[PDB]
Fold Insecticidal toxin protein TcdA4.
Amino acid sequence: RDTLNEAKMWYMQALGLLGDKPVSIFSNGWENPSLSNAADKTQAKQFHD
Amino acid sequence: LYNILTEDTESLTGSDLENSLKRNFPKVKIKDLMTLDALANYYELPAD
């Protein structure tokens, strides 16, 4: 029993290191693009520019 | 809870909207509840 409370305090310390679980967004500015539109050469040129 | 889920909250305008938000949410700030963490913790369901 006491070693299970030990287990709980170790995992709670690990959760204290990690913190708040990041909520993954799904409602997003991601439109659904065309594969022709997604792979434009200008779309990487402007990015690295 | 049946009296909560019974209410005709749809198509309810005017000050009766303010009265219904005051009844169904007595203690919270609605502007504080708008975020997703508040809606996860307030109703005790995971944010996913």
User: Anything to note?
Assistant: The longest helix of chain A spans residues 2-18. Residues 1 and 7 of chain A are 10 Å apart (CA to CA). Chain A is about 60% helix and 0% strand.
